Design a binder for this molecule. Structure first.
Ligand SMILES: COc1cccc(Nc2c(C(N)=O)cnc3c(C)cc(S(=O)(=O)c4cccc(C(=O)N(C)C)c4)cc23)c1
Ligand SMILES: [As]
Ligand SMILES: [As]
Ligand SMILES: [As]
Ligand SMILES: [As]
Ligand SMILES: [Mg+2]
Ligand SMILES: [Zn+2]
Length: 336
């Protein structure tokens, strides 16, 4: 059972210390990365799977698991400022937390739990650090492969599933054929749902099902068919993907630094190509602070307010943090 990936003996203890917060929204993944020799995705996934007894439940070899996860992590670009393996580790650990929210207790099968955490792990692999629209506009190889439709999201799925082809890395070897087929369908569904171009419609359909939600006597949501279960799962992974502004301000600020570095790098590439600069990618004019206020007001809060509404009162502290964070960025804009 691996306890360190480096030569620092002090790190083994520090890492296990950080990992005591595995089931908490307040886990600090930057620290995890620091104490794991930059293996946040390998280590958090190993911790999550052991925490949930998923290697035992699905007869996944620890050895095969580590090899697969190391190589998946290696397919995230460490030179991409935001969409790298630390983001993937964060989305996976955040999904692990949402899976345990009391309102959803006993709702999901082990296969659905597995699908959801694996989807989070893979959902941005081999991201080149520019948007779908930038790929479409530049006639990139990916956009020609995917006919301009959910270009990156299709690619992330293709890489994550292609890596399982080699026997040495097939973590799903001992699932049954029907299990593998259902898992693949769920993961494909979840990852494609992370495409921001689908968010307005995802949310609409979410606000819709919150309306007719049936909380049972004991306080647990009744989600009786597959259709309802995969809809909550697809929204959960989406929420996890868009969870940075709901974390402690200390963490949220570090995430903002990264996403703006990535966005402004795209702006530079656009300029360089004589392309039209996308407003929020232009380092010469865009306000980092307004960009987060708007991001929260227009995208993150409506999603989380609706999730919160669905899992009442589970997500109340998340909302308060979000609103506090929103307030902090606003207060950072020098104008009234
Ligand atoms: C889920 O996919 C993404 C991609 C990029 C950022 C985020 N989350 C954001 C973050 C974040 N920390 O998660 C921060 N700021 C954001 C700001 C300021 C804006 C947007 S946006 O309105 O979704 C937007 C507007 C215009 C272009 C693009 C783009 O490049 N892609 C690929 C979607 C994105 C998202 C985020 C999520
Ligand atoms: As670990
Ligand atoms: As392999
Ligand atoms: As994103
Ligand atoms: As942009
Ligand atoms: Mg993505
Ligand atoms: Zn993501």
């Amino acid at each position: 059972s691996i306890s360190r990936f480096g030569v620092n003996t002090e790190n083994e203890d520090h890492l296990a210390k950080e990992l005591e917060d595995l089931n908490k929204w307040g886990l600090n993944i930057f620290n995890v990365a620091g104490y794991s020799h930059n293996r946040p995705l390998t280590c958090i996934m190993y911790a999550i799977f052991q925490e949930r007894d998923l290697l035992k439940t699905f007869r996944i070899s620890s050895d095969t698991f580590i090899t697969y996860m190391m190589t998946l992590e290696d397919h995230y670009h460490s030179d991409v400022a935001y969409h790298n393996s630390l983001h993937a580790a964060d989305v996976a650990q955040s999904t692990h937390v949402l899976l345990s929210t009391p309102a959803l207790d006993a709702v999901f099968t082990d296969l659905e739990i597995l699908a959801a955490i694996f989807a989070a792990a893979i959902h941005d692999v081999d991201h080149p650090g520019v948007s779908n629209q930038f790929l479409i506009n530049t006639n990139s190889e990916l956009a020609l492969m995917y006919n301009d439709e959910s270009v990156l999201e299709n690619h992330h799925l293709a890489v994550g599933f292609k890596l399982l082809q080699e026997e040495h890395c097939d973590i799903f070897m001992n699932l049954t054929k029907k299990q593998r087929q259902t898992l693949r369908k769920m993961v494909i569904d979840m990852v494609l749902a992370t495409d921001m171009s689908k968010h307005m419609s995802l949310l609409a359909d979410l606000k819709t099902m919150v309306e007719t939600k049936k909380v049972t006597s004991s306080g647990v949501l009744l989600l009786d068919n597959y259709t309802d279960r995969i809809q909550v799962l697809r929204n959960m992974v989406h929420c996890a993907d868009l969870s940075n502004p709901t974390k402690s301000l200390e963490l949220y600020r570090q995430w903002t630094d990264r996403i703006m570095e990535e966005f402004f790098q795209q702006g530079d590439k656009e300029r360089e190509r004589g392309m039209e600069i996308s407003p929020m990618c232009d380092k010469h004019t865009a306000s980092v602070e307004k960009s987060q206020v708007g991001f929260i007001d227009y995208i993150v809060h409506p999603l989380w307010e609706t999730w919160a509404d669905l899992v009442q009162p589970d997500a109340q502290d998340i909302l308060d943090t979000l609103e506090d964070n929103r307030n902090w960025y606003q207060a950072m804009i020098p104008q009234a």
